[PDB]
Design an enzyme around this catalytic site. Structure first.
Site, mmCIF file in Angstrom:
data_model
loop_
_atom_site.group_PDB
_atom_site.id
_atom_site.type_symbol
_atom_site.label_atom_id
_atom_site.label_comp_id
_atom_site.label_asym_id
_atom_site.label_seq_id
_atom_site.Cartn_x
_atom_site.Cartn_y
_atom_site.Cartn_z
ATOM 1 N N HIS B 231 1.019 -1.584 0.008
ATOM 2 C CA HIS B 231 -0.489 0.161 -0.048
ATOM 3 C C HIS B 231 0.794 1.623 0.007
ATOM 4 O O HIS B 231 0.679 2.714 -0.879
ATOM 5 C CB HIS B 231 -0.988 -0.268 1.040
ATOM 6 C CG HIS B 231 -2.018 1.194 1.138
ATOM 7 N ND1 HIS B 231 -1.292 2.315 1.681
ATOM 8 C CD2 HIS B 231 -3.286 1.381 0.997
ATOM 9 C CE1 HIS B 231 -2.341 3.416 1.939
ATOM 10 N NE2 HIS B 231 -3.542 2.579 1.649
ATOM 11 N N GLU B 235 0.952 4.041 -3.442
ATOM 12 C CA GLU B 235 1.113 5.605 -3.634
ATOM 13 C C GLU B 235 1.981 6.059 -4.041
ATOM 14 O O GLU B 235 1.635 7.590 -4.152
ATOM 15 C CB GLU B 235 -0.290 5.650 -1.980
ATOM 16 C CG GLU B 235 -1.130 4.865 -0.802
ATOM 17 C CD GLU B 235 -2.458 5.275 -2.087
ATOM 18 O OE1 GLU B 235 -2.031 6.178 -2.993
ATOM 19 O OE2 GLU B 235 -3.451 4.324 -2.601
ATOM 20 N N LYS B 238 2.344 6.379 -7.474
ATOM 21 C CA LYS B 238 0.605 6.860 -7.863
ATOM 22 C C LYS B 238 1.408 9.033 -8.041
ATOM 23 O O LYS B 238 1.244 9.044 -9.423
ATOM 24 C CB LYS B 238 -0.064 6.580 -7.816
ATOM 25 C CG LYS B 238 -1.196 5.211 -8.142
ATOM 26 C CD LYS B 238 -2.572 5.605 -7.660
ATOM 27 C CE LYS B 238 -2.786 5.402 -6.702
ATOM 28 N NZ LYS B 238 -4.375 5.792 -6.081
ATOM 29 N N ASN B 239 2.515 9.271 -6.508
ATOM 30 C CA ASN B 239 2.405 9.941 -7.102
ATOM 31 C C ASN B 239 2.961 10.217 -7.720
ATOM 32 O O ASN B 239 3.841 11.109 -8.831
ATOM 33 C CB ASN B 239 2.592 10.440 -5.463
ATOM 34 C CG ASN B 239 1.348 10.702 -4.168
ATOM 35 O OD1 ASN B 239 0.553 10.521 -5.257
ATOM 36 N ND2 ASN B 239 1.239 9.930 -2.665
HETATM 37 N N1 LIG Z 1 6.423 12.937 -6.172
HETATM 38 C C1 LIG Z 1 5.650 13.354 -5.723
HETATM 39 N N2 LIG Z 1 6.044 14.923 -6.354
HETATM 40 C C2 LIG Z 1 5.370 16.351 -6.384
HETATM 41 N N3 LIG Z 1 3.753 16.732 -5.425
HETATM 42 C C3 LIG Z 1 3.558 15.783 -4.904
HETATM 43 C C4 LIG Z 1 4.379 14.231 -5.166
HETATM 44 N N4 LIG Z 1 4.104 13.745 -4.316
HETATM 45 C C5 LIG Z 1 2.295 13.471 -3.432
HETATM 46 N N5 LIG Z 1 2.965 15.166 -3.701
HETATM 47 C C6 LIG Z 1 1.522 16.298 -3.455
HETATM 48 O O1 LIG Z 1 0.672 16.484 -2.283
HETATM 49 C C7 LIG Z 1 -0.813 16.085 -2.490
HETATM 50 C C8 LIG Z 1 -0.845 14.946 -2.110
HETATM 51 O O2 LIG Z 1 -0.717 13.608 -2.402
HETATM 52 P P1 LIG Z 1 -1.605 12.277 -1.959
HETATM 53 O O3 LIG Z 1 -1.442 12.528 -0.258
HETATM 54 O O4 LIG Z 1 -0.618 11.202 -2.243
HETATM 55 O O5 LIG Z 1 -3.672 12.738 -2.377
HETATM 56 P P2 LIG Z 1 -2.904 12.792 -3.838
HETATM 57 O O6 LIG Z 1 -2.430 12.071 -4.667
HETATM 58 O O7 LIG Z 1 -4.856 12.647 -4.054
HETATM 59 O O8 LIG Z 1 -3.197 14.187 -3.745
HETATM 60 C C9 LIG Z 1 -0.628 16.006 -4.216
HETATM 61 O O9 LIG Z 1 -2.202 16.249 -4.439
HETATM 62 C C10 LIG Z 1 0.694 16.596 -4.954
HETATM 63 O O10 LIG Z 1 0.112 17.852 -5.441
HETATM 64 MG MG LIG Z 2 -1.311 10.114 -3.852
#
Ligand SMILES: Nc1ncnc2c1ncn2[C@@H]1O[C@H](COP(=O)(O)OP(=O)(O)O)[C@@H](O)[C@H]1O
Ligand SMILES: [Mg+2]
Ligand SMILES: N#Cc1c[nH]c2ncccc12
Lengths: 338, 359
Positions: B231, B235, B238-239
């Site tokens: 998990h 996640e 995906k980010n």
């Molecule tokens: N690797 C990354 N590079 C740039 N921005 C990121 C990254 N990981 C997370 N973020 C930022 O953090 C926010 C929150 O991420 P997350 O909690 O996974 O929820 P979501 O992916 O639904 O937005 C994202 O909307 C994004 O703007």
């Molecule tokens: Mg996310």
């Protein structure tokens, strides 16, 4: 008397832009003759709540005596007119005297801390309060030294200590060479520097921001010393040394520097110990970064290496002093999870 | 609240280590002892979090979603307390207890989306969201960690002692005593790749390196719960994939996502590095707030649960999850897990004066 009075004022934080746009001698004189006593008085009141055996060390007594004398030296100019030329010139001389008097404040305070810790029992609450106090005490000094040196340098290419076009990469290279020289002297070898830079704000253009280069040099020198030591010691059974990799990135809001080594890393359990208070270079380096709303973090891969990252504000208007204030919230600072 | 909730909320949860969970599922496998422990511990954990549900904003507690969760937890607590009179030597009681855990597990299956739905409604009807409300952020960390912990304990009993729910043959309950970390990384990456390809018709490649400092040149294994590890990685991938594709969308090719897995004496560390433009330090903290997302709310992104929930899984057994970004270039996401099962101890919230003060 004067300590209690001026401790009632709250410090007035300045931006790097203010220090630039401003740098009139009469105006600086009027501001600093008020502001420096305020900052000295605020931190003097905080010294008085430290453990008694710590305050009574000769070292802390020296610091307290120096700070009180400098406050009185400065308060004496409140009876002088800004138009009094001898007072303006004497004020410069007094700032130089105060700077000379405070030259050894950092090692003297550290001596008191070490003497208290070695001799006396320190409960966890007291240990946390000492960390809290030392961060605030050393930040306070960083800030008074900053303001005083600005006035000295301007009125006794940079605007005082501020380079309005700080060549960040050049500072990185200079700090690395400083560390290299010591590493070679002690170990007969040193890692090389592999530097890359990315100008996201101005693609392919050199990276410049408004900053105090001596502060940036201090932060990088400390991180490079630690990264070089870790590399040499971790790879003592090796013919060559892995380089120290550095990337400098200028974003829209932030200027970031990441320093990577393969010096074996540190277990997460004890990573925070490196920031505990000679072993003061790293916590003080973090204070320099946070002084203008930046930051300094370490994230290590135990068994491989460590990443050190410096964040600085890219805009001078957002580079604002982060100053400790002795107030109800401070005094109060001195089980919901299993 | 019912008398049973008030009573069992007075106890503190008892955290277990993964070493204990392993032992209790193999050599020290005693169904009677696990029954005796869980019939008390599960009521305690449910009662502790039910007390914190009561102090939430009245506008949130009264949503149909939160009332349902409350109703579920209360019934599960009552289901379990009904076993307090039975004898561990009663084989019919042990069998019925397994059936009851399966019932409770099925009942709680939709807790996370139900609670999230409630948060969404409370946001639309009152403008209150965990991003700005620190009390709601504080509660959600504790509520979701609480659920992680009760699901962990019940699943362990079900998967060890049930007739028809055996789980993975190579696992002890949900714990893999020889978790192939790199294999989970690759699996999670592929999962994220498949979803990324559906939103963008492209996805960055994986460049994976591994360093076993503890056992040089040996495969990297630790005792761990692979579903939890999957998990977190899923996640974070995906980010990293969204950030990479959207930042390089005008480039002829995609820079890969770089992953290093390192086993040290005390730590297993996984660093995931992308060149997806990074994040301003100012909003780094916001990123870990429940519901915070730079994407519109809908799934690849938009619900804003990836980072905070992934951090909970990491911290559940004394690990951690951090994000360090180079705004204008890319981001490093780093997972820390304890390399020793004896140090992998449950991190549990407790309802006490200290908790009440935070609210
Ligand atoms: N690797 C990354 N590079 C740039 N921005 C990121 C990254 N990981 C997370 N973020 C930022 O953090 C926010 C929150 O991420 P997350 O909690 O996974 O929820 P979501 O992916 O639904 O937005 C994202 O909307 C994004 O703007
Ligand atoms: Mg996310
Ligand atoms: N600052 C810093 C460090 C950078 N690398 C390190 N490795 C071991 C211990 C400290 C460090």
């Amino acid at each position: 008397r004067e300590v209690e009075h001026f401790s009632r004022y709250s410090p007035s934080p300045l931006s790097m832009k203010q220090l630039l746009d401003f740098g009139c001698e009469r105006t600086s004189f009027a501001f600093l003759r008020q502001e420096l006593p305020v900052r000295l008085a605020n931190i003097l009141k905080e010294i008085d709540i430290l453990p008694t055996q710590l305050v009574n060390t000769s070292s802390v007594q020296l610091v307290k005596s120096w700070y009180i004398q400098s406050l009185m030296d400065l308060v004496e100019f409140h009876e002088k007119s800004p138009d009094d030329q001898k007072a303006l010139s004497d004020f410069v001389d007094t700032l130089i005297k105060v700077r000379n008097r405070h030259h050894n404040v950092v090692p003297t305070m550290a001596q008191g801390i070490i003497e208290y810790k070695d001799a006396c029992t320190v409960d966890p609450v007291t240990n946390q309060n000492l960390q809290y106090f030392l961060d605030r005490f050393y930040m306070n000094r960083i800030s008074t030294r900053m303001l005083m040196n600005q006035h000295i340098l301007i009125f006794s290419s940079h605007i005082g200590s501020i380079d309005p076009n700080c060549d960040v990469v050049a500072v990185v290279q200079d700090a690395f060479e400083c560390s290299r020289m010591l590493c070679d002297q002690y170990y007969l070898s040193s890692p090389e520097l592999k530097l890359t830079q990315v100008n996201g704000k101005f693609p392919d253009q050199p990276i410049h921001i408004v900053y105090v280069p001596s502060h940036l040099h201090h932060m990088l020198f400390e991180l490079f010393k630690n990264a070089m030591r870790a590399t040499v010691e971790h790879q003592e059974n090796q013919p060559s040394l892995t380089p120290i990799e550095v990337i400098v990135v200028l974003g829209k809001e932030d200027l970031t520097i990441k320093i990577s080594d393969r010096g074996g890393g540190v277990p997460l359990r004890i990573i925070d110990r490196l920031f505990s208070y000679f072993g003061y270079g790293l916590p003080i380096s973090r204070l320099y970064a946070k002084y203008f709303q930046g930051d300094l973090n370490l994230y290590s891969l135990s068994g491989y290496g460590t990443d050190a990252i410096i964040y600085l504000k890219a805009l001078s208007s957002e580079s604002i002093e982060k100053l400790p204030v002795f107030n109800k919230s401070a005094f109060k600072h001195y089980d919901d999870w299993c």
